[PDB]
Chains A and B, each alone.
Chain A
Amino acid sequence: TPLPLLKDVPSSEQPELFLKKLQQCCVIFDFMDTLSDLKMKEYKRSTLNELVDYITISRGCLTEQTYPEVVRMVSCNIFRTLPPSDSNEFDPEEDEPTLEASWPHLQLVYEFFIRFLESQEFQPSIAKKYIDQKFVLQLLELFDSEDPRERDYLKTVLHRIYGKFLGLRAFIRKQINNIFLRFVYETEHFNGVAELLEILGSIINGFALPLKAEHKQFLVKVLIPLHTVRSLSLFHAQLAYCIVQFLEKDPSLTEPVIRGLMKFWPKTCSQKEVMFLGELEEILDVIEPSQFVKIQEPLFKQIAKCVSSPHFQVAERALYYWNNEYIMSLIEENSNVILPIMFSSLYRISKEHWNPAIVALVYNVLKAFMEMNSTMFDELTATYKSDRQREKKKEKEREELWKKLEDLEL
């Protein structure tokens, strides 16, 4: 139905032409077929360009009668079932994403929507009847889109819905929890994890001082187990931001966070181990001394294992802790507790590591433990092979023990 432009019509017929244009934009074209209906796609693209920009400034064109039409328009355009993906894994630096092809229309529709919620005349008490729980359920389903441009637009749209409608905030967070729990414990197949973590990063940034037990359960039971999935390289920065923000708001939550990061420490993925070390440096950068001491023993047992790892990347990332001055200061305060944890590890890697760079770094770390807290060092190198005989006789004791256990069962 060839309709004219809104600038070529009077102000009386302006709202009814606006509504009619949205009705025409409820028609979906086939972009997988490149040559089909070429002229009418250009008509809808130009018509979408008229619809956007028009809604930007305060003008009163957003009457209540336009609310259901614009909701139905964007619902007919973006809401759909995503096609199957020929891939099961994704490599950011090598693998390439599959585009949606209807973007020359979807982008404008998304741009129309993100500006409709951002409109100066937008009223949420009226729009909540149409942007309901069923609408956002489909919207969060759209987050599995393989197109990163669509995922970025859905990021901003979901942030706008969360900020405008406060009655949906509990439902939004619960649905993201459902998405994250299925992504972790069932099927690892979700492309919008990084965007959802950015949304949550802003939400956690805007939390209350009396932190609800619901959000503490959200951090412990959902955010921490998210560290286990293999695709952690796709959202390590956003997850680290959410963890650091939770600790910046409640430093008392640093105990369940540390225990979680070491309960899920990477044992078969070295790049994941380096990411854990990089994230842990951030947690230790925003740590408090009274909270550090509470977990300093099992923590430094882990870094003692990390500095003693034969993986040069993990060893470098763990030995670079001794270059950060603040976490150095915490070592200087509790050296009599963590130096015996590190000593045997550093002296072993001072002899058994293959990388000459790593054996030079552990020498520098040992020189630090000698310049500071010397008496600890002297009475530990004096009780070196004495303790090494103790552990060696303990091992053969366990071995002959298990030999006798197998002798009794026979």
Chain B
Amino acid sequence: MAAADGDDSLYPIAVLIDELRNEDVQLRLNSIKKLSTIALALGVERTRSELLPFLTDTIYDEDEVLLALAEQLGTFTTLVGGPEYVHCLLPPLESLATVEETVVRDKAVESLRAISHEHSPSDLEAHFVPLVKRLAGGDWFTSRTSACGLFSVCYPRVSSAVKAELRQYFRNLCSDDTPMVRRAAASKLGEFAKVLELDNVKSEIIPMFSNLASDEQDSVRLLAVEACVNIAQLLPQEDLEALVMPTLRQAAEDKSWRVRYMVADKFTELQKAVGPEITKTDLVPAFQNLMKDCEAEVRAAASHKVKEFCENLSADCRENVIMSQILPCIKELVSDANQHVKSALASVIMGLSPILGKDNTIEHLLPLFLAQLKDECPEVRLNIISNLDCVNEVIGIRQLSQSLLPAIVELAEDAKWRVRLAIIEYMPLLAGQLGVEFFDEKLNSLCMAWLVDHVYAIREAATSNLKKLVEKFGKEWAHATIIPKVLAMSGDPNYLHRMTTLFCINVLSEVCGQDITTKHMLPTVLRMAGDPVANVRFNVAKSLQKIGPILDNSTLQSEVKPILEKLTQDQDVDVKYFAQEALTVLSLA
């Protein structure tokens, strides 16, 4: 039997409950994962009055089905009756918020934060808020560390009478005896302070934050200084010097390297969120100290922020600050012992070129760029080559050819192939800016030599570089310089270098034009169609398919069709497949 319209069904619920709390772990886990089709087959009435009280009282089994059920009930607002009945989901989830396993209570607090907005202020102050009080007052740490994440989702939509209750409750959660929940409180410090009124973020959030920032365990001090960014985003620049700054000054020169690393990693975030004048007064010596730190991780984190910090200084003093206080520490950092520090500094150092000025980067920055170019570590070398376009824009192209071009030509054949790849990827800019005469005399040899590199990735990069050089200089220059050597590679006794000819023809038919690709490149492919290696043969088929749309139909029918037909009758299967596919795509068979 069926219903008139009501979701209510005569479906036996026994055969449904005979799988949720029955069978092995996998079957009941799948039933809980699918606990939504059964809620639709039962109906809103029967789901609220016959399946939810079920799940409320069945404290059973391992944490996997518990996690699945929490995630499922996170989306059960409509299946129980809408915003009117969501309060029936709060009991089961509450039990899931006290579970020992972290993932279960985390999914539970996620589901609670999701359905928190589905309540009205009456339902919040009548069902959710008491649930928060119950969870944050439990005997075990799991309930408290899970309840620490319920304050921000129900604080703004409740009355002005439970505000002090919840505030002092969160304060009690901060002054907890176990560090486990103290860590979560320090984490949610900022998240709860952003939803608080200004009259409360400076009278009760600031003392709590300072207390957490001077705790016995650095493990919570690091989260305190992390939430400092969100906290200082609320107080005006007049109160900071009295409320946020005293904790920051001691956190900068703290005994533990972890909170110092957190200070250095969020240094520019603080710089922007707290103000520019005070950074001129306070944060510049702090940066000088962090870049001269005894720990190496802190030095690396500080060097990573050099560029974005220096370009975010005040506009008037910047030229004096970076030259008289920041640049000496940078000169010290290039000769560091730790390779991570040097690499992180080289990854951002060239960004200081437009801030300093052409003469300043020539006199003060170019020797350091050179030194990092001749560095022994490959990562710092790659990072310093990465940002060469910035330097080339600041200084002159002629000046770059005078100072840094020999180093680039040397790194063109570096031991590690990714440095060579960086040089190849910077080749088109250098060619376009230096001109075809200088390129043909100097840099053409490197671009043609990369085509027979041992690493295949370098050969692919050179293949693409050929097309880019054509896009820079012209298909006429391509026919004059590039095409002869590319076709000469067709006689290499190594099939790996022989397929590079086909790859070059493929990438060059897009830019050389129908005439050039018909009179110079097509004969080479059609001759290579009889190569002994099957790889070269199916690559000939693929290359013909690639270059097809560039020739006129007479050439496809007169010279390409017989070659593809003869390749379809080869002994290898892959060459036959590719020749037949080329015939089909080119619309020839």
Shortest CB-to-CB span from A188 to chain B, Å, is 11
Stretch at the interface among A67-75, A149-157, A338-346, A402-410: A402-410
Q: How far is the CA of A225 from the CA of B9 in the complex (A)?
A: 43
Q: A102 interface residue, CB < 8 Å from B?
A: no
Select B180's contact among A81, A185, A263, A402, beta carbons within 8 Å.
Answer: A185
User: How many A-B contacts are there with CB distance less than 8 Å?
Assistant: 52
Find out whether the CB atom of B257 lies under 8 angstroms from the CB atom of A83. yes
Find out whether the CB atom of B37 lies under 8 angstroms from the CB atom of A405. yes
Return the chain B residue nearest A82 by Cβ. Answer: B257
Find out whether the CB atom of B100 lies under 8 angstroms from the CB atom of A409. no
Find out whether the CB atom of A84 lies under 8 angstroms from the CB atom of B256. no
Please give, as numbers and ranges, the residues of chain B lying within 8 Å of A81 by CB-CB distance: 218, 255-258
Q: How far is the CA of A401 from the CA of B297 in the complex (A)?
A: 59
Q: B19 interface residue, CB < 8 Å from A?
A: yes
Q: How far is the CA of A134 from the CA of B216 in the complex (A)?
A: 9
Q: How far is the CA of A401 from the CA of B27 in the complex (A)?
A: 13
Select A186's contact among B40, B62, B180, beta carbons within 8 Å.
Answer: B180
Q: How far is the CA of A186 from the CA of B40 in the complex (A)?
A: 38
Shortest CB-to-CB span from A218 to chain B, Å, is 13
Q: B48 interface residue, CB < 8 Å from A?
A: no
Q: B179 interface residue, CB < 8 Å from A?
A: yes
Find out whether the CB atom of B180 lies under 8 angstroms from the CB atom of A406. no
Select A406's contact among B11, B37, B178, beta carbons within 8 Å.
Answer: B37
Select B19's contact among A181, A263, A398, beta carbons within 8 Å.
Answer: A398
Find out whether the CB atom of A409 lies under 8 angstroms from the CB atom of B41. yes
Q: How far is the CA of A225 from the CA of B102 in the complex (A)?
A: 11
Shortest CB-to-CB span from B414 to chain A, Å, is 26
Q: A211 interface residue, CB < 8 Å from B?
A: no
**Cβ < 8 Å to A, chain B residues 10-41:** 11, 15, 19, 27, 34, 37-38, 40-41
Q: A137 interface residue, CB < 8 Å from B?
A: yes
Please give, as numbers and ranges, the residues of chain A lying within 8 Å of B41 by CB-CB distance: 405, 408-409
Known: A84-B297, A181-B180, A185-B180. A409 touches B140 (CB 8 A): no
Binary per-residue interface labels of chain A (81-92) against chain B in the complex, 1 for a CB within 8 Å, 0 otherwise? 101100000000
Please give, as numbers and ranges, the residues of chain B lying within 8 Å of A83 by CB-CB distance: 257, 295
Return the chain A residue nearest B39 by Cβ. Answer: A409
Q: B101 interface residue, CB < 8 Å from A?
A: yes
**Cβ < 8 Å to A, chain B residues 209-238:** 216, 218-219
Q: A221 interface residue, CB < 8 Å from B?
A: yes
Q: How far is the CA of A181 from the CA of B19 in the complex (A)?
A: 34
Find out whether the CB atom of B257 lies under 8 angstroms from the CB atom of A84. yes
Return the chain B residue nearest A265 by Cβ. Answer: B62
Find out whether the CB atom of A401 lies under 8 angstroms from the CB atom of B40. no
Please give, as numbers and ranges, the residues of chain A lying within 8 Å of B101 by CB-CB distance: 185
Please give, as numbers and ranges, the residues of chain A lying within 8 Å of B38 by CB-CB distance: 405
Q: A182 interface residue, CB < 8 Å from B?
A: yes
Return the chain A residue nearest B142 by Cβ. Answer: A185
Please give, as numbers and ranges, the residues of chain B lying within 8 Å of A381 by CB-CB distance: none
Q: B141 interface residue, CB < 8 Å from A?
A: yes
Q: A36 interface residue, CB < 8 Å from B?
A: no
Q: How far is the CA of A137 from the CA of B15 in the complex (A)?
A: 57
Known: A405-B38, A408-B41. A186 touches B183 (CB 8 A): yes
Q: A178 interface residue, CB < 8 Å from B?
A: yes
Find out whether the CB atom of A408 lies under 8 angstroms from the CB atom of B40. yes
Binary per-residue interface labels of chain B (246-288) against chain A in the complex, 1 for a CB within 8 Å, 0 otherwise? 0000000001111000000000000000000000000000000
Return the chain B residue nearest A225 by Cβ. Answer: B100
Known: A185-B100, A185-B101, A409-B37. A178 touches B255 (CB 8 A): no
Binary per-residue interface labels of chain B (121-150) against chain A in the complex, 1 for a CB within 8 Å, 0 otherwise? 000000000000000000011100000000
Find out whether the CB atom of A221 lies under 8 angstroms from the CB atom of B100. yes
Binary per-residue interface labels of chain A (2-36) against chain B in the complex, 1 for a CB within 8 Å, 0 otherwise? 00000000000000000000000000000000000
Return the chain B residue nearest A394 by Cβ. Answer: B23
Known: A221-B140, A398-B19. A178 touches B100 (CB 8 A): no
Shortest CB-to-CB span from B184 to chain A, Å, is 9
Select B216's contact among A137, A221, A401, A409, beta carbons within 8 Å.
Answer: A137
Binary per-residue interface labels of chain A (314-346) against chain B in the complex, 1 for a CB within 8 Å, 0 otherwise? 000000000000000000000000000000000
Please give, as numbers and ranges, the residues of chain A lying within 8 Å of B142 by CB-CB distance: 185
Q: How far is the CA of A398 from the CA of B20 in the complex (A)?
A: 12
Find out whether the CB atom of B180 lies under 8 angstroms from the CB atom of A182. yes
Q: How far is the CA of A401 from the CA of B178 in the complex (A)?
A: 49
Shortest CB-to-CB span from A170 to chain B, Å, is 12
Please give, as numbers and ranges, the residues of chain B lying within 8 Å of A134 by CB-CB distance: 216
Binary per-residue interface labels of chain A (212-225) against chain B in the complex, 1 for a CB within 8 Å, 0 otherwise? 00000000010001
Find out whether the CB atom of A186 lies under 8 angstroms from the CB atom of B102. yes
Q: How far is the CA of A43 from the CA of B297 in the complex (A)?
A: 33
Shortest CB-to-CB span from A192 to chain B, Å, is 15
Binary per-residue interface labels of chain A (171-207) against chain B in the complex, 1 for a CB within 8 Å, 0 otherwise? 0000000100110011000000000000000000000
Q: How far is the CA of A401 from the CA of B9 in the complex (A)?
A: 15
Return the chain A residue nearest B9 by Cβ. Answer: A408
Please give, as numbers and ranges, the residues of chain A lying within 8 Å of B102 by CB-CB distance: 185-186
Please give, as numbers and ranges, the residues of chain B lying within 8 Å of A264 by CB-CB distance: 62
Binding site for B on A (CB under 8 A): 81, 83-84, 134, 137, 178, 181-182, 185-186, 221, 225, 263-264, 398, 401-402, 405-406, 408-409
A-B contact pairs, 17 of them (CB 8 A): A81-B218, A81-B257, A81-B258, A137-B216, A181-B141, A181-B180, A185-B100, A185-B102, A264-B62, A398-B19, A402-B34, A405-B37, A406-B37, A408-B11, A408-B37, A408-B41, A409-B37
20 more A-B residue pairs beyond the given contacts A221-B140, A409-B41, with a C-beta to C-beta distance below 8 A: A81-B258, A83-B257, A83-B295, A84-B295, A134-B216, A137-B216, A178-B179, A181-B180, A182-B219, A185-B100, A185-B102, A186-B180, A263-B63, A264-B62, A398-B19, A398-B27, A401-B15, A402-B34, A408-B11, A409-B37
